[PDB]
Amino acid sequence: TTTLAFKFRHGVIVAADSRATAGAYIASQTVKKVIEINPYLLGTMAGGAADCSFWERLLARQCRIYELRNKERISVAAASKLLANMVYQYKGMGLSMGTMICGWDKRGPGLYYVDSEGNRISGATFSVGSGSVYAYGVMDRGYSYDLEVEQAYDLARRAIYQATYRDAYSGGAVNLYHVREDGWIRVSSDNVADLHEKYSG
Amino acid sequence: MEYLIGIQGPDYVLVASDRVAASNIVQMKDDHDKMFKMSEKILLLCVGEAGDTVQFAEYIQKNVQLYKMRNGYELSPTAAANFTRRNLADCLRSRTPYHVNLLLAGYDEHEGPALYYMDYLAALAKAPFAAHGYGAFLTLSILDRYYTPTISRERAVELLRKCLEELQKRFILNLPTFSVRIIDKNGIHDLDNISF
Amino acid sequence: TQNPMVTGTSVLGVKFEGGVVIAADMLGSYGSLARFRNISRIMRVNNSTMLGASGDYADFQYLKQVLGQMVIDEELLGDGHSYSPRAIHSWLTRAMYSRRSKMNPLWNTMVIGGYADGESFLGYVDMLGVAYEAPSLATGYGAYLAQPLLREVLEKQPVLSQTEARDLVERCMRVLYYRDARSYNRFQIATVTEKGVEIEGPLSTETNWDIAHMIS
Amino acid sequence: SRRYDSRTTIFSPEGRLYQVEYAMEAIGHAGTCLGILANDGVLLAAERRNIHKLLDEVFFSEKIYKLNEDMACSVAGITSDANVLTNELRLIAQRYLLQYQEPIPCEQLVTALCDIKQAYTQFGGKRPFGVSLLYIGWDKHYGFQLYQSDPSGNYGGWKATCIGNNSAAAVSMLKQDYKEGEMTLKSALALAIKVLNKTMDVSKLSAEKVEIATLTRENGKTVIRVLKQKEVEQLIKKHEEEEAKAER
Amino acid sequence: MFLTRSEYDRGVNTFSPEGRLFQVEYAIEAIKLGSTAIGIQTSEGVCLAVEKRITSPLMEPSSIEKIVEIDAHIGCAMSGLIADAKTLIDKARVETQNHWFTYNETMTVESVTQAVSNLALQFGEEDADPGAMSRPFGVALLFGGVDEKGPQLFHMDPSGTFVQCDARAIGSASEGAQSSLQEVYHKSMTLKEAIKSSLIILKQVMEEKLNATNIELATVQPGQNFHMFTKEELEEVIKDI
Amino acid sequence: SYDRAITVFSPDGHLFQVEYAQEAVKKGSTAVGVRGRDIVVLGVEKKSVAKLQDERTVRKICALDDNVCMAFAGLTADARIVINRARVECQSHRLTVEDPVTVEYITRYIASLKQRYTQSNGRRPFGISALIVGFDFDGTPRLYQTDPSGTYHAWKANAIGRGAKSVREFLEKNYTDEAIETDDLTIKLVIKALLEVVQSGGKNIELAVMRRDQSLKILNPEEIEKYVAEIEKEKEE
Amino acid sequence: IGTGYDLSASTFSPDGRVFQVEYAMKAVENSSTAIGIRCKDGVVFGVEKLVLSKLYEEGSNKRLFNVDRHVGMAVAGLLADARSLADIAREEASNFRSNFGYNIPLKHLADRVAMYVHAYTLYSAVRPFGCSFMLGSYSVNDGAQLYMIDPSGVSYGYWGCAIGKARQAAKTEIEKLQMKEMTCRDIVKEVAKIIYIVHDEVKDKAFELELSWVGELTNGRHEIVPKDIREEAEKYAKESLK
Amino acid sequence: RFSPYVFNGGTILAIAGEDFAIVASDTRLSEGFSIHTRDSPKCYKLTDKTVIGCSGFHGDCLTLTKIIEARLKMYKHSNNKAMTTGAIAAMLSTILYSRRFFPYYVYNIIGGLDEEGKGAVYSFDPVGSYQRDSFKAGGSASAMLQPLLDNQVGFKNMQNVEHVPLSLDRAMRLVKDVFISAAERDVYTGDALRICIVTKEGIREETVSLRKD
Amino acid sequence: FRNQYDNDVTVWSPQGRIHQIEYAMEAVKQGSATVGLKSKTHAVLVALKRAQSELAAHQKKILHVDNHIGISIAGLTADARLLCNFMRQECLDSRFVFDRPLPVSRLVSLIGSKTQIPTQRYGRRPYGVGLLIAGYDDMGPHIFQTCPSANYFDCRAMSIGARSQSARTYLERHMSEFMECNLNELVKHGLRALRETLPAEQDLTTKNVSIGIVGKDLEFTIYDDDDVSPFLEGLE
Ligand SMILES: [K+]
Secondary structure, eight states: OEEEEEEETTEEEEEEOOOEEETTEEEESOOOOSOOOBTTEEOOOEESHHHHHHHHHHHHHHHHHHHHHHSSOOOHHHHHHHHHHHHHTTTTTTOOEEEEEEEEETTEEEEEEEETTSOEEEOSEEEEETTHHHHHHHHHHHOOTTOOHHHHHHHHHHHHHHHHHHOTTOOSEEEEEEEETTEEEEEEEEEHHHHHHHHOO | OOOEEEEEOSSOEEEEEEOOEESSSSEEESSOOOEEEEETTEEEEEEESTTHHHHHHHHHHHHHHHHHHHHSSOOOHHHHHHHHHHHHHHHHTSSSOOOEEEEEEEEETTTEEEEEEEOTTOOEEEOSEEEESTHHHHHHHHHHHHOOTTOOHHHHHHHHHHHHHHHHHHOSSOOOOEEEEEEETTEEEEEEEEOO | OOSOSSEEOOBEEEEETTEEEEEEESOEEETTEEEESSOOOEEEOSSSEEEEEEEEHHHHHHHHHHHHHHHHHHHHHOSSOOOOHHHHHHHHHHHHHHHHHTTOOOOEEEEEEEEETTEEEEEEEOTTOOEEEOSEEEOTHHHHHHHHHHHHHHHHOSSOOHHHHHHHHHHHHHHHHHHOTTOOSEEEEEEEOSSOEEEEEEEEOOOOOTHHHHOO | OTTTOOOTTSOOTTSOOHHHHHHHHHHHTSOOEEEEEOSSOEEEEEEOSOOOTTOOOOSSOSSOEEEETTEEEEEEEOHHHHHHHHHHHHHHHHHHHHHHSSOOOHHHHHHHHHHHHHHHTTBSSOOOOOEEEEEEEEETTTEEEEEEEOTTSOEEEBSEEEESTTHHHHHHHHHHHOOTTOOOHHHHHHHHHHHHHHHSTTTOOOGGGEEEEEEEEETTEEEEEEOOHHHHHHHHHHHHHHHHHHHO | OTTOOGGGSSOSSOBOTTSOBHHHHHHHHHHTTSOOEEEEEETTEEEEEEEOOOSSTTBOTTTOOOEEEEETTEEEEEEEOHHHHHHHHHHHHHHHHHHHHHHSSOOOHHHHHHHHHTTTTOBOSTTSOTTOBSSOOOEEEEEEEEETTEEEEEEEOTTOOEEEBSEEEESTTHHHHHHHHHHHOOTTOOHHHHHHHHHHHHHHHOSSOOOTTSEEEEEEOSSSOEEEOOTTTSHHHHTTO | OOOOOOSOBOGGGOBHHHHHHHHHHHTSOOEEEEEOSSEEEEEEEOTTOOTTBOGGGGOSEEESSSSEEEEEEEOHHHHHHHHHHHHHHHHHHHHHHSSOOOHHHHHHHHHHHHHHHHHBTTBOOOOEEEEEEEEOTTSOEEEEEEOTTSOEEEBSEEEESTTHHHHHHHHHHHOOTTTTSSHHHHHHHHHHHHHTTOSSTTTTEEEEEEETTSOOEEOOHHHHHHHHHHHHHHHHO | OOSSSOSOTTOOOTTSOOHHHHHHHHHHTTSOOEEEEEETTEEEEEEEEEOSOTTBOTTTTOOEEEEETTEEEEEEEOHHHHHHHHHHHHHHHHHHHHHHSSOOOHHHHHHHHHHHHHGGGSOTTBOOOSEEEEEEEEETTTEEEEEEEOTTOOEEEOSEEEESTTHHHHHHHHHTSOTTTOOHHHHHHHHHHHHHHHOOTTTSOOEEEEEEEEEGGGTTOOEEOOHHHHHHHHHHHHHHHO | OOOSOOOOOOEEEEEEOSSEEEEEEEOOEEOSSOEEESOOOOEEEEETTEEEEEEEOHHHHHHHHHHHHHHHHHHHHHHSSOOOHHHHHHHHHHHHHTTTTSOOOEEEEEEEEOTTSOEEEEEEOTTOOEEEESEEEEETTHHHHHHHHHHHTSOTTOOSOOOOOOOHHHHHHHHHHHHHHHHTTOTTOOSOEEEEEEETTEEEEEEEOOOOO | OOOSSSSOTTOOOTTSOOHHHHHHHHHHHHSOOEEEEEOSSEEEEEEOOOOSSTTBOOOOOEEEEETTEEEEEEEOHHHHHHHHHHHHHHHHHHHHHHSSOOOHHHHHHHHHHHHHGGGSBTTOOOOOEEEEEEEEETTEEEEEEEOTTSOEEEESSEEESTTHHHHHHHHHHTHHHHTTOOHHHHHHHHHHHHHHHSOTTOOOOSSSOEEEEEETTEEEEEEOGGGGHHHHTTOO
């Protein structure tokens, strides 16, 4: 499992693999690990899959309730704090949620890292997962806030590809998302079988 | 492990903290701020187990701000420190204890500068200087060697830089940047970060 | 019951043409000790169903009390409807599952046999709520010892007469007495038919020991 | 049962709370208690209504209740409700002391007790506390203070006020005679004796019929001292001399 | 025992000799004091209109919201004591989002109306918990939206009776507006005709003159979501009258 | 626990307890609030002018937060309770949502609390009407009121308490684009609104002002007197 | 006699009468009469169950309940409260068997249910039950028992009792019996006779006789009287009524 | 000590198609080195367009199936319509997460027609995470069923082969083949194979025999 | 003061009557007419759906309760829905515990106890709704009537609501035929009884009639506007 998210001049890029394992057995190669919380705010599934899915669905429910009550769309900071509080209510009970909540609000692009342990930190580059270290490597060697949209796309794809290459528990398709001022877009679902041919020449 | 330090001068409280937020063998953040402005003249430097720190700091911050709004006058640093100790000690034997190590820096018109030290057991102690984390072991010797009660703020900054250089030289963890704030009678002042 | 104290051993059951027959010995063992030697482990729940239980006899007695009172209330209503053997099996499964979920299992494994609406019912339920229906059921060491014979008879001949089923149960209980340390010679046999539930006992199974002289 | 319910916590057709108003009439028939805020102290003077000479008066005082190290109060109204309120006041002051390790500001204690009275006039169906209190205190925020409280849970910071029998006349006299920011402890004591003279018209104001306690600051410690019989006698005699001198 | 007034000689859950809860009838009477609301369910949408009833020019109409959004496919027009409508609106929103969370599908308008209507008679005295309501809600709501069955319009009164209405008018001018809607409704009338007809009826029943700031109009079409018309969008239909 | 239904529907659909709370509001001191371009002004009448009182302790304008403040008409103790809950809710929302509360959010909270007391068992409605003023994060001034029934609306200018109708008519006749052009004009508008009902000028006016990115400011009596003098010259001409 | 002191069971009249309990008794004496007679080998119940409309099925609104395997129950008054008390008695017998491990004596079941109904004659928050009922059981080691419980909550053993509109006439005609020496097969016949005598065919048009005995004939099981025996009893009652 | 869970064996399999859905399961019920009954099918019918397979601890399988049936009845009563396959999947995720801290030991696969008449196969874990799949195999022999379905239905690791759309005739043959191979190497699967076909007409039901020991 | 015998459910009239119970009965009597029947193999409920206005769809009156049982409401609809939810919950609990349908008579007994509970407590009110319960169990078709007094009746046919006496008279005169009727003419008899309630100026239309039938091999099915036509054709 590798997921990454980084902010740049044109939004935040979210990229994740699609492999879920039960031991050394590959349960699925088509896991949708970028949780579309709502059309203006994305989520990330890293750690316990059901935990992330359920709690980010509750986050979506609470965000939609907030939009109904207040007639204004929820901020990324508020949604991240909601998730952090909900998870912190269950500290030590075995939750294995680690998520990156992405969005664009009145404070520009927003990226937060929320985990079951209780962390909630904003940042410009995050990658959570088993293959997260291999994502940090090339993501940091390629990152610049002035990246073009295509260069950011390629950076995220290559980072997830290398993380899949090294980490045994990461693999599958490289789903990539781009959160802009008017929502997010699914740009690609490239398979590492094709990415290996693209990157090996 | 995270790092805090405070130096109480005649008319100020200089506080510094590392900016590294690591949740693995990797540092996830390099500009993390572990100082919480509870009032115009109070700072709570909170470190400890993740999740507990932010929740407890924000709880005490909410209560101090509520006191300010409800009464029109701020809590003194001594009163805020005792409130923080009471809350932590009450939660010590509760079902959801907070594992946080605290430094509460503040200034009062009458009591003057104040620096307070709280361990995760909620044992409060007013000290001329204090520190937390494994870097306290390396830096408190320098603090003992070179601190005097009438230290100026520029000499205090120099002493703090000596402590940080000691961390950079003989401490395994990589803490490149430290936040620096001073609480004077004018309030909380942001000083330039000490980096390397 | 986190740990059992006095346990009943295997309880048998095989369907036949016109009802079912269940057999269980009359012993309650405290570990290796054969403490209570004439306790009945077969209950007549109502005119149409019966219940033989292995495991803790205290939990069996409690569950016997609850089921008997439930049948008494049913009869009090007097509205024609009565608990089918299927209903008893389902209620028993729900009770045992509820008790495992509270981490307070009823340390019994139970065989429900009935005959309602011209259909023979043989049901299983254990402390964990596992339930199913089979032509033949064996509990505990009966599953390893008696059940193979029951299956090898019922696979060739799917339907047995009352006498054939009774003979097969007697043979299986003889085998259990031979090769089960917690068995007792005395046992009861209960049958459901159109006529109702009849419990016969204390039956004793004849044993052969002619291989004693062979061993040297 | 709705038939027997007295409907204590409901509104009147004209928008007033009858129970609070009735408790206020009860207080208006109670013992006179006035306090005057001075530059160097604050005092409580309270008429004692039980004067019968078979009383013992064992305690520190009969009207003035010490609330904490730095505060005191008087009562007009029902004595038992006064006792429960003063116990609650002591609990609140000590709860702040435990929570913050510093003395409670006076207005906070008044606000807490008034919030409890509001609760009793908001919900629950219970009758209100027919007690109006008269607080005197000191804190590092606003110095010497004097506070009034009402059964409805209202409070006000007063520099001179009177609660109880003949409260209106005492308030009028205080308004005429109080000198803003220029009243010392001795001037306040003389004014209190003079006001109590025209308030206890029937009783002729003996020193056995008034209980005076002063709150001053000495060496960073607050001292709450009930005036002795000798010095209350001296105050009364001085006022008598001044009244005789007025004829000259 | 004196000074007790007959305002509280009866309990809340007491029946009249005619078999009607006194509190429900009094809440229905309170409905007849609220602002008039009109809703029409056409085959290509549901329109809801309500007078703002601006007391003084200093009051901003934008704040006085008498039509709200339960979700993207459900609306609600409220008449009566608007303060009591907010609890029901919050419950409806919570139910819709719970249904989406549990089932991954939009909740039927009839189901939402039923869920809110179950709260109507959930009021009482000491028999219940401290959080129990003491009196019926003095609000009649017009739920309108699109679902699997198409455009739907519903009406819930304090009695808890929710009924599907092709065109319903609630509020002070319910009778005259209802007679007019009887005169004008056809099963095959378009949404534009529905909007124009509703505004005509409001003009007929409103004491104030119809303008772009003293009414609220919203539509729920089988395509786009719940939509609140605005100035530069409500003049475009007011002018035709 | 007490569970009687204090507020019940009367015939003709009236909630008598709410109407009685409104009547209690009508007997409270007049409070006026005006929303300007870059300043929001609140003013309250002081019938309690009595000179042996500490003015700090009977303030009728309270700061709910750094950017929200309110003035009330009606029972003082109920107002204290509502103000305390509003402050607690402001601080809770600032922790949970990271941002300062908008005026409409705390107005909704106060209105919901009043309505809940209107409909819950065993408690009377709050006999207070509020005027919740303040500035939003985007710099848009706001002004709301919360009646005891629980209804909240936004007003350009309003009056609560005794003489609400008179001051409301005055504000209707004297609230124009020019009357709120500058801060001083808004101050004078609120003072002029109060002078329509107060017995004597200056001494019976409590006037607090809130402007952008600044906390509430209690105008001292000298400033009120100088303003009132300015209205005196303006009225002479 | 009242109008000021009859509003709650928690109020005493100036002459020490709880008028609400008396009104519950007024309610129970406006219901069809149910009689029970105790003989050597059991007790036989009888009910003049009126049929209000003929649209009902034969057996609707039974007034002869069965509260335990050996205890019957005849009821008069409000049938909702009668059914509620039947469930209370059933629960009491069930709890007795669960705890003490044997069948509840009717002398104890009557006391328990009577105290339950007495608990409703004390508080303004509840109202007294509007039903007086009879309990009957037979066990070989305790004999035949017959008890009545009224809204007040008084329990007494009876050799024969009547509850309902025609209590007085039914008791007057029961006294003519010698139930102490008779058996159930004859007591059922006489119960039918009594019910048909006390019934009035001009005010309440139609009724169906509901009978049930518990006794030695039924091994202690309380059972509805067999159809043939009911037919014979009704035949005798009609012939006697001439 | 007491262990609430026992693994009762059993394999379930679902293949989705253009206009059909196949749900198959063995009838073997096992406990330790023993066989409980040879006729315990593990595919349950929820609606005319949905069949659920349950494998794992048998008690939780029964309880979850009865809870699901009760919840479908509740939904039909409350909303006056049957529950679609996606709604059943979401509800099952919620039900499974209701006991996250005492999880059902049930592997769930829901196969049925979606609202557009196409096949829909939803997989599950004990704690509730689900996703839509072309095909999934759960139970003891999942590791043996899954690769062959990947190679044939998914056409993975196969070059120059045309991706023929899957038909009912070939899907049934493939299900039978994978289960015959599963019995030959997994001790918990066998004694029968019940195949449920969800098609527009309704739910069909076959049973093919496979080895007993 | 006031009549002092009418407000409280726990106050007995000096005549031995509780007036709140009778007022809830009146609430039932003010509702729209429902009539139900049963053959030896079927139990049919037909209800006269009433419309608030000519533009409003008529109120639903037959409600599903279980796989094998249904109800027809008359009175307060919110009380009807609460009691229906209780019935549904009890049926589902019986299916969960015993894996068998809940017998109709026992369900009606549970309804009786649950509705009797508020009859005896202060502050509580009787359930102002009358329910015509038709179900099929092992003991053949059943039809039940439940009153706000918590008294329930085992009927052969019954009508409750407004102008119910005419329907009851028709049912009484034609009871003798219902047992041997088939489904079609049984529901025709029900429709005739329901028409007997209607005034002279109205007659049954697909809009204002709903039919619910449960039988030996028949799911309980509510028949609505379009589906009522085959039963409607052939009356008059
Ligand atoms: K095998």
